[PDB]
Design a protein around this ligand. Structure first.
Ligand SMILES: Nc1ncnc2c1ncn2[C@@H]1O[C@H](COP(=O)(O)OP(=O)(O)OP(=O)(O)O)[C@@H](O)[C@H]1O
Ligand SMILES: Nc1ncnc2c1ncn2[C@@H]1O[C@H](COP(=O)(O)OP(=O)(O)O)[C@@H](O)[C@H]1O
Ligand SMILES: Nc1ncnc2c1ncn2[C@@H]1O[C@H](COP(=O)(O)OP(=O)(O)O)[C@@H](O)[C@H]1O
Lengths: 626, 1300
């Protein structure tokens, strides 16, 4: 199923002809020839794309006047109507906007655009809207529909960009050497960083809507910089005397810095700047991906020789990335067409049998006892005690939240089954719970709250969710009932991992070098236990997962096995002061946001590949695997 | 009777009372005194006199109020119709105003004739005229808007002013007086201006302005002279415009001088001589010029002169830091100095590492440099490339802020965006310095910024008004919380802003604005900003037309170390760098590894609060080590919010960072701590405990520091009492204090802040804003504390961000902006936050009450103190001698000692204690009445009886027998005389003697045969219900008694039956009754309507002869109203403000800030076994109602016996059919049992529901044919007389059961 889609293109080319599987791009000047005066032009747009500037540009090119514009909203019907009447008598152009709200005026338009009420020639109408059903099809049945989401392929977006700001940006130079190369650099950067998002959370934590606005912003800056640099240049040594490090900072943090909500993306984007700009215009070198000559149609040909489908090592990113993308892509595609084809039963009994399998509650009158009875960092160092030792208070907090969830689950399973077999006036929440129990997804009652109460959100009803909760409670109980500190802690189970680590810090400060060591003086570090087969200060973590290399002697991953185990990364803390190293994050879930960043780990294992290689490769040490 | 006349400029004279504050206030405590007297027992005679007196006083008030309001309307409209052209151009309402002038003059002359305002108000004709005149004057204003728009056009700033206040501004009637109270909301910082009369020949002397003043606090101020003067004239726009211009010009010239003086005189002289703004400019220009000179001197050859200039700055640092910081006079002068100090700290920090070879180097081309050009005399501020001239606005001393690198990122970004003609729209989480960063870039560039506050109740017309003002003037706008706004409004705003962007792009002097036909001009130095907040509840998206304009600035994590260290430098500390790390690490650790509670906050607002606190402590004489002072400050600040458990963790964490220090005492304030027990003893029912000392003092401190605060904590915990007692102690030592209350979800937010009317196209006033305007007047003596009280839902609260932020300005969709004063504070008596984003958690301080602060036992001792007040013979001692051990060591052995696992109403047990106390008082009321004192044993029996119910009222028979066995095991005697399988509940204690008996009296029916006429019979359940009810309902409004009751029973378990049995027994000659029912979509306005129609009078202002009898409000089911999505239902809150306090706010489109009063009412309710599908009532409300179960009867063979007896004794022909008839009475029951048990409801047959109603319907069908059944003779179709009867039984049972 990985290579479904190209095969799809293939037999389509066979049974229907290869002409179908070939690019199309709509010449807006060509499209204008279709629009008679008596039919409008609709526009089903997507986020981060608008043809309004191009429509205006054409209206200045062929037509000689600026169009008039009315934005839909509230209290704009009569305004729209009177401007349309002016257009009717005269023959101007009108730009409606935001029809996705304020639909009451739409039905009127079909009556207006009629043969009865006569209209002066050369009058066009341009409509724009968005995905709102309950949109009567009077005009959908009679209009011209056009889509202007940005192009897919790398060459596609590159070519389009090479038909946005062209032939007078390009042709106005007074220098074929330097800033021609700067245009080419920035354009390639644009087209690469936009397309990086195709992979998913590996490439970008969330989606960002870069468009051309940032581009011509940067172009306006750098043209000012070069014009006022060379304004004092009476003679060019070799075409320029620029010190291009400021431009790095600008294109890094100011122009494109607007969208960026994450921290890691900042230095990731700086790295892309480093590797692509090179900190110099070589003039003679091979881009990692060719390099140009100085003529326009030559740029068009340069685009022509670019391959259609590329491989992700162009971005620096590993081949295996490809795999996951295709799978999810295939997984949705068939489902689309799968739609076009022409409960209160033993499932609740299955849940009924389930609820007599999750464990019993832990009454606090017992638990407070048990936690107070036994506790210490080291049996020799201290006698049993409760509050004072950080790990015991952590034990109590974790048991508290666990019980808070256990009670809710037991109660709602009961009251879900006690409506039919039992009796109560049916609730809507309980009905939602029934539907969720039949499907794979757990009800919202166990994940979220009106603000947010994330607990253990995993996919299956019981395959992993209750499995995970059971494992958490098992380890927590054996961490309590015996009361002894086991080796190989499971970090995923703890609701608040960070408290674990800071408690370890406090433990080291108190037990050792106490006072010789202050809390604010201590800093953090880690040594990876490079060993299969095996206390001192620090902890032993079990269950981390790496992505994309080995533990030590890190190398390229094979085609399968994208997610790999993580060995025992024993910790270390030291008083402060008492660039070959690479620093990795640790994300709880594989969603990869600013939240869930528990801590950062230095991983020196380099060999020949400098760390920036790894930084663009987007390694990370996530915790769960989903 | 002293009154202030406007003038004699016509035949008549129009006047107002400028002493009326004294009138109102002394009136208020007059009526307080009169009610205080009347309530007391020994006030027999005064009733004839006093009521009449109060009545007159009450009545005169509202008449006066209406009158003076109309006067203000007229006092706005007079100058409008003096001008010839406008009077000509609209003759109709001009002559209507001639008519009102005639009528108004007649009223004034009648008042003049009277000479005394009280007979003047007593006139009855007046009252009809006044509101009709009011409405007509509203119509006149609705004529005058068409001229208001043009007058606004003639001068920019009026766009940031609302309509009626603009009218008042335009009706000056005087040079000095009228505008002297309005300079604040028309310029940035000016508040006072002198007026010097120049006597022109033959013209009256014209007042002219000569200097300007910025006042902060009371006496501290900044004065600015003027060489160029400004003269008043005939046209208000003229002298306002001249004020602006001449200000700009003199500011320019003083700066032009000051730039020479800076390098001539030397540091100290010009910093001391000049004002703050010019001083900061001088420092910046000196540094840039000297650093430049050093850089070129490096360029010539290797030189030390650059190092000499850097050393000169370093030398300047010590002289500024040593003297001007530690000792100084006055607040304004104080703020100036550290404003210089922070800049200089950052200055030297940059200059240390400033390794740039020449001016062209980027490291030099990264900061906000300045150059005051001489050859063309003008300022010019410079950034990387952008440049712009200083805008010359007098601001005086403002507390500008530190410069972290992130602020540099913002500065560079915003300069670039403004160079490309856009508007920055920064974003991030709450409290990272967005709005203040914008405001500071405004302040440094010399411009004046205008923050507003969008909200869902906005409309595009007002945004257009704003933007027109922005383009006309040259000012900057910062639309805080721009996202929380309607979608289509954003759709049209997209157009407006795009039009202005294209206009500015061409550099075109004149341009066209959409929707507005007249052509309008532009000034370049404008800008737009929206500080939107990504992602909450009630937050929409920007349609893609609008994302084009603004450039993003991502402000996620502010710096926290550098700001702290430079602030500590600014105060003048010596242990800077260590302490900074201490602050940061402590607040971090506290954030992560402490328990998760919704209300905790450790953001930058808390930190800055600590810093602005910490200034004074070092300013005190002590030279003790700084770290001690700092530990004390941090610990004592952050204690208040923490719940019980987190306190040990918090101070154990403190010990790990300051191990050198062991302990310090808390600085204790002696006056208040000695004062508190005095009034705690002054009351009857108040027990002092140490926890109260701690919490009330903590409240005092957080009051002292911050704007507003919250009292989070569970029910019955003493919050309102704490507020009351605090207000008392503050008032005792002078400095009075007043408190107002409000309930936000018992009124609709549209009414709370007012909207534009949705019928007549005209504004209505808002309640909360009316209280705001009435409160923040200067020249008062109170210190008002507006109390909101309810839940915290985000939708209504969150549009008070500006008032609770450092802006402390209220902003409306009207266009009205009201400035906060220090006279006023905002408080919330809310239970707990569960629907609050951090943007509202971090804005205000907070204090947490805990359940164990005031145990129920202390409340019992307070009641005991009351018993030793009058009935002090021995009763307090005797009663309690059982109570203490009988309550402390018993109550917790009922919750789950024995099973008791069906407490239908989950509660906290303090409510049970309030309940049993209220019951016991009514129990002993009879022997209080006869003045008889009893032995100990009878009292023990009474307590057993009292608390049997009121803890036994929430349980079923099985739990009740287990309860009973407990009481047998370890309690005082219950009935033992027979106890033949009968519980303790069955019997009652008799007043006449110590006995445990019970019965239901015999009573049959009247002769009528209607099923209603067979209304109800005397059951056992009904009689015991009356027994319990009557005790509470006789008690006369004791504290902790609302005189309100509430039953609990299944749907069809004799609710309205027993209640109506009670209600018939009323005496309508001194006791009335009213009925109401509840459904899901019953709204607060509906309940408001029914209660207003019930009373029909405002019984607060000495009214309602017919409501003087006592009334009762009965409600069947308080559960059914629709719970909101959050979980907080919005109907019961009106009831809760009715029970707790009586009365509410009016909504009659005429007056807002005022409340009707209920001086007498009664209340009763009934529940339906809450749990599962049945809703529940708000827990805050559970504290007031008596709650107990209403079980099924288990005796239904004996309810219907009589009606069959009375039917039976007509024929007398039933030799054997009588026994049969009784068997029918029992066999219907057998059938009922079998069918009800066997066949059930499922969601496909949900309505398969059975109760006792159908038995009544069966009998109702049977009871017919008083003798027609006998007439079997016509048919006799093998029919005995009984056969027809059993056939009737069969058909009946089929049609009542075998149908649905
Ligand atoms: N010093 C005191 N001594 C004895 N009893 C007290 C004292 N202070 C308060 N109480 C009692 O405590 C109760 C005060 O409850 P309060 O009205 O303060 O609840 P609250 O905290 O305001 O919450 P809510 O407003 O939801 O009731 C009253 O019953 C009062 O009699
Ligand atoms: N760099 C800074 N220097 C001084 N104070 C700052 C700084 N950044 C933030 N603050 C403080 O934060 C508060 C402003 O927060 P604000 O920007 O209003 O939050 P929001 O942007 O969510 O409205 C002020 O008390 C301000 O002094
Ligand atoms: N004491 C009584 N005498 C005669 N009929 C009674 C008596 N008590 C209850 N009933 C009958 O039982 C029914 C109980 O209905 P009711 O209590 O009004 O419903 P709900 O409990 O929902 O208020 C009544 O309709 C009434 O006819």
């Amino acid at each position: 199923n990985d290579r479904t889609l190209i095969a799809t293109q293939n037999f389509i080319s066979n049974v229907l002809g290869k002409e179908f599987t070939d690019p199309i791009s709509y010449p807006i000047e060509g499209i204008w020839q279709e629009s008679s005066n008596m039919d409008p032009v609709l526009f089903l747009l997507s986020a981060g794309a608008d043809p309004t500037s191009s429509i205006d540009e054409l209206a200045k090119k062929k037509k000689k006047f600026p169009c008039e514009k009315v934005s839909m909203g509230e209290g704009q019907e009569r305004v729209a109507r009177q401007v349309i009447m002016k257009g009717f008598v005269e023959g101007g152009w009108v730009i409606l906007q935001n029809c996705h709200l304020g639909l009451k005026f739409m039905e009127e338009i079909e009556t207006l655009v009629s043969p009865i009420n006569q209209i002066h020639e050369d009058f066009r109408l341009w409509i724009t809207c968005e995905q709102h059903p309950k949109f009567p099809l009077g005009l959908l049945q009679k209009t011209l529909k056009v889509t202007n989401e940005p192009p897919k392929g790398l060459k596609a977006g590159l070519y389009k960009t090479f038909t946005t700001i062209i032939t007078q940006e390009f042709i106005d130079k007074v220098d074929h050497s330097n800033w021609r190369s700067l245009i080419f650099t920035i354009c390639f950067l644009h087209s690469i960083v936009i397309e990086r998002k195709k992979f998913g959370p590996l490439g970008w934590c969330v989606p960002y809507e870069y468009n051309y606005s940032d581009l011509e912003a940067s172009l306006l800056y750098i043209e000012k910089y070069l014009t006022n640099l060379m304004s004092t240049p009476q003679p060019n040594s070799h075409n320029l005397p620029i010190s291009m490090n400021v431009v790095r900072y600008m294109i890094c943090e100011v122009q494109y810095g607007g969208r960026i909500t994450d921290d890691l993306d900042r230095e990731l984007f700086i790295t892309y700047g480093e590797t692509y700009l090179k900190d110099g215009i070589f003039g003679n070198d091979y881009f990692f991906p060719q390099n140009p000559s100085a003529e326009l149609i030559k740029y068009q040909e340069y685009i022509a020789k670019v391959p259609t489908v590329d491989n992700p090592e162009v971005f620096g990113l590993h081949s295996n990335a490809d795999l996951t993308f295709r799978l999810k892509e295939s997984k949705e595609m068939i489902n689309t067409v799968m739609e076009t084809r022409p409960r209160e039963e033993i499932v609740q009994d299955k849940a009924k049998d389930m609820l007599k399998n999750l464990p019993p509650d832990y009454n606090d009158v017992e638990v407070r006892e048990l936690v107070s009875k036994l506790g210490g960092p080291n049996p020799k160092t201290s006698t049993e005690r409760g509050m004072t030792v950080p790990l015991n208070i952590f034990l109590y907090q974790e048991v508290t939240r666990m019980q808070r969830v256990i009670g809710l689950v037991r109660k709602t399973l009961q009251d879900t089954i006690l409506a039919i077999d039992g009796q109560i006036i049916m609730t809507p929440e309980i009905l939602e719970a029934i539907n969720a129990i039949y499907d794979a997804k757990v009800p919202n009652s166990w994940l979220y709250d009106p603000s947010g109460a994330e607990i253990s959100w995993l996919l299956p009803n019981l395959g992993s969710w209750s499995t995970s909760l059971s494992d958490r409670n098992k380890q927590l109980n054996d961490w309590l009932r015996s009361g002894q500190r086991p080796i190989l802690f499971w970090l995923t189970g703890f609701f608040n991992p960070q408290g674990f680590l800071t408690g370890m810090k406090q433990e080291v400060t108190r037990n050792h070098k106490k006072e010789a060591w202050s809390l604010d003086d201590v800093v953090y570090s880690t040594t990876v236990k490079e060993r299969e087969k095996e206390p001192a200060e620090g902890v032993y973590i079990k269950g981390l997962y790496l992505e994309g290399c080995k533990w030590s002697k890190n190398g390229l991953d094979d085609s399968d096995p994208k997610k790999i185990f993580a060995d025992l990364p024993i910790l270390h803390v030291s008083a402060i002061n008492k660039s070959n190293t690479y620093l990795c994050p640790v994300y709880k879930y594989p969603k990869r946001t600013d939240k869930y960043l528990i801590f950062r780990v230095g991983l020196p294992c380099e060999g020949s590949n400098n760390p920036s290689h790894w930084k663009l490769r987007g390694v990370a040490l996530l915790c769960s695997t989903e | 009777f002293q009154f202030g006349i406007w003038g004699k400029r016509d035949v008549p004279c129009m006047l107002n009372g400028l002493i009326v504050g004294t009138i109102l206030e002394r009136l208020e405590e007059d009526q307080l005194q009169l009610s205080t007297f009347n309530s007391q027992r020994h006030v027999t005679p005064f009733k004839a006199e006093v009521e009449n007196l109060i009545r007159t006083f009450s009545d005169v008030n509202d008449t006066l109020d209406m009158w003076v309001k109309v006067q203000k309307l007229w006092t706005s409209l007079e100058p409008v119709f003096t001008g010839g052209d406008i009077a000509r151009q609209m003759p109709l309402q001009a002559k209507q105003f001639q008519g009102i002038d005639k009528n108004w003059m007649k009223i004034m002359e009648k008042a003049v004739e009277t000479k005394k305002v009280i007979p003047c108000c007593q006139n009855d004709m007046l009252k009809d005229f006044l509101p009709d005149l009011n409405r007509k004057l509203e119509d006149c204003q609705k004529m005058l808007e068409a001229y208001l728009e043009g007058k606004r056009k003639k001068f920019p700033r009026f766009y940031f002013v609302s309509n009626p206040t603009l009218l008042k501004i335009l009706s000056q009637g005087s040079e000095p007086t009228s505008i002297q109270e309005d300079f604040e909301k028309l310029f940035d910082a000016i508040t006072k201006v002198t007026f010097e009369s120049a006597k022109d020949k033959k013209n009256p002397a014209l007042k002219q302005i000569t200097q300007i003043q910025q006042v902060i606090g009371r006496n501290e101020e900044n004065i600015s002279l003027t060489g160029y003067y400004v003269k008043c004239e005939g046209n208000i726009e003229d002298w306002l415009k001249k004020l602006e211009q001449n200000m700009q010009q003199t500011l320019k010239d003083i700066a032009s001088a000051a730039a020479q003086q800076v390098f001539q005189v030397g540091l100290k002289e010009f910093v001391s001589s000049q004002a703050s703004q010019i001083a900061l400019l001088g420092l910046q220009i000196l540094w840039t010029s000297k650093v430049n000179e050093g850089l070129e001197r490096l360029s010539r050859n290797e030189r030390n002169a650059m190092d000499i200039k850097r050393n000169e700055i370093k030398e300047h640092m010590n002289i500024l830091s040593s003297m001007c910081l530690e000792d100084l006079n006055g607040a304004v002068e104080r703020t100036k100095v550290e404003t210089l100090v922070t800049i200089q700290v950052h200055q030297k920090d940059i200059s240390m590492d400033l390794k740039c070879k020449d001016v062209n180097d980027f490291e030099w081309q990264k900061q906000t440099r300045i150059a005051w050009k001489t050859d063309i005399d003008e300022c010019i501020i410079s950034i990387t490339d952008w440049d712009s001239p200083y805008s010359y606005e007098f601001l005086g001393a403002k507390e500008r802020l530190c410069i972290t690198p992130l602020t540099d990122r913002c500065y560079i970004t915003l300069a670039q965006a403004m160079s490309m003609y856009y508007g920055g729209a920064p974003a991030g989480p709450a409290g990272t310095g967005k709005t203040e960063t914008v405001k500071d870039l405004g302040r440094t560039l010399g411009v004046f910024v205008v923050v507003t506050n969008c909200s869902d109740q906005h409309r595009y017309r007002d945004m257009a008004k704003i933007f027109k003002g922005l383009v006309q003037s040259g000012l900057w706008g910062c639309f805080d919380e721009f996202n929380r706004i309607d979608l289509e409004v954003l759709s049209v705003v997209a157009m407006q802003v795009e039009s202005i962007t294209t206009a500015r792009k061409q550099h075109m002097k004149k341009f066209m604005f959409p929707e507005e036909e007249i052509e309008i001009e532009l000034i370049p130095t404008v800008s737009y900003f929206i500080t939107m907040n990504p992602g909450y509840a009630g937050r929409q998206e920007l349609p893609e037309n609008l994302k084009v304009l603004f450039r993003g600035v991502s402000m996620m994590v502010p710096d926290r170390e550098i700001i702290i260290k430079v602030k500590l430098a600014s105060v003048g500390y010596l242990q800077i760098d260590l302490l900074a790390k201490k602050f940061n690490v402590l607040y971090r650790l506290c954030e992560e590894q402490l328990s998760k509670q919704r209300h905790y906050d450790f953001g930058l607002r808390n930190i800055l609060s600590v810093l602005r606190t910490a200034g004074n402590t070092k300013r005190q004489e002590i030279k003790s080590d700084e770290e001690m002072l700092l530990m004390r400050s941090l610990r004592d600040m952050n204690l208040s919010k923490l719940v019980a458990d987190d306190i040990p963790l918090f101070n154990g964490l403190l010990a790990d960072i300051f191990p050198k220090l062991k302990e310090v005492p808390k600085k204790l304030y002696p006056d208040v701590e000695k004062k508190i027990p005095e009034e705690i003893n002054a009351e009857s029912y108040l027990i002092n405990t140490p926890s109260f000392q701690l919490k009330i003092i903590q409240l005092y401190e957080t009051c002292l520091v911050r704007h507003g605060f919250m009292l989070v904590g569970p029910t019955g915990s003493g919050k309102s009492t704490i507020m009351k007692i605090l207000t008392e102690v503050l008032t005792k030592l002078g400095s009075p204090h007043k408190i107002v209350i409000m309930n936000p979800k018992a009124i609709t937010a549209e009414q709370m802040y007012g909207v534009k009317s949705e019928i007549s196209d005209d504004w209505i006033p808002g309640v909360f804003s009316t209280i705001w305007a009435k409160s923040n007047n200067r020249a008062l003596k109170h210190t008002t504390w507006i109390t909101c009280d309810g839940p915290v839902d985000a939708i209504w609260i969150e549009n008070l961000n500006t008032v609770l932020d450092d802006n402390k300005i209220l902003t409306l969709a009207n266009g009205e902006r009201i400035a906060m004063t220090e006279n006023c504070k905002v408080v919330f008596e809310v239970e707990n936050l569960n629907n609050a984003s951090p943007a509202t958690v971090s804005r205000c301080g907070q204090v947490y009450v805990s359940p164990t602060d005031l145990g129920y036992e202390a409340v019992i001792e307070g009641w005991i103190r009351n018993r030793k007040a009058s009935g002090r013979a021995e009763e307090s001692d005797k009663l309690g001698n059982i109570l203490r051990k009988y309550l402390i060591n018993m109550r917790f052995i009922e919750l789950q000692s024995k099973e008791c696992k069906e407490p239908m109403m989950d509660t906290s047990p303090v409510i049970s204690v309030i309940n049993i106390l209220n019951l016991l008082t009514g129990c002993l009321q009879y022997f209080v009445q006869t003045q008889r004192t009893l032995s100990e044993q009878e009292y023990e029996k009474f307590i057993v009886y009292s608390m049997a119910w009121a803890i036994g009222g929430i349980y079923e028979a099985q739990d009740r027998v287990r309860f009973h066995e407990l009481l047998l095991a370890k309690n005082a005697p219950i009935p033992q005389k027979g106890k033949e399988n009968e519980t303790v509940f069955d019997y009652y204690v008799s007043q006449d003697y110590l006995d445990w008996k019970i019965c239901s009296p015999e009573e049959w029916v009247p002769p009528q045969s209607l099923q209603f006429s067979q209304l109800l019979l005397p059951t056992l359940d009904s009689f015991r219900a009356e027994m319990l009810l009557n005790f509470i309902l006789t008690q006369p409004k004791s504290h902790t008694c609302s005189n309100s009751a509430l039953l609990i029973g299944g749907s069809g378990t004799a609710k309205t039956s027993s209640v109506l049995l009670y209600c018939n027994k009323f005496d309508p000659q001194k006791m009335l009754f009213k009925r109401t029912n509840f459904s899901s979509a019953t709204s607060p306005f509906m309940f408001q309507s029914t209660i207003e129609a019930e009373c029909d009078f405002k019984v607060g202002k000495e009214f309602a002869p017919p409501g003087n009898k006592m009334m009762t409000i009965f409600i069947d089911d308080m559960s059914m109203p629709f719970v909101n999505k959050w979980g907080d239902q919005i109907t019961l809150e009106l009831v809760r403000q009715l029970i707790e306090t009586g009365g509410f706010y009016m909504l009659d489109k005429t007056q807002r800030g005022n409340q009707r009063k209920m001086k007498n009412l009664q209340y009763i309710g009934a529940m339906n076994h809450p749990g599962g599908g049945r809703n529940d009532i708000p827990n805050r409300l559970k504290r007031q109602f008596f709650i107990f179960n209403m079980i099924l009867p288990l005796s239904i063979e004996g309810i219907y016996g009589p009606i069959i007896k009375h039917m039976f004794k007509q024929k007398y022909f039933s030799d054997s059919t009588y026994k049969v008839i009784e068997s029918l009475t029992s066999a219907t029951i057998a059938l009922w049992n079998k069918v009800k048990s066997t066949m059930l409801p499922t969601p496909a047959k949900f309505h398969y529901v059975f109760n006792m109603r159908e038995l009544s319907r069966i009998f109702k069908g049977i009871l017919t044919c008083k003798k027609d059944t006998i007439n079997d003779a016509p048919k006799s179709m093998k029919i005995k007389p009984e056969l027809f009867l059993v056939g009737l039984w069969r058909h009946e049972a089929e049609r009542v059961l075998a149908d649905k």
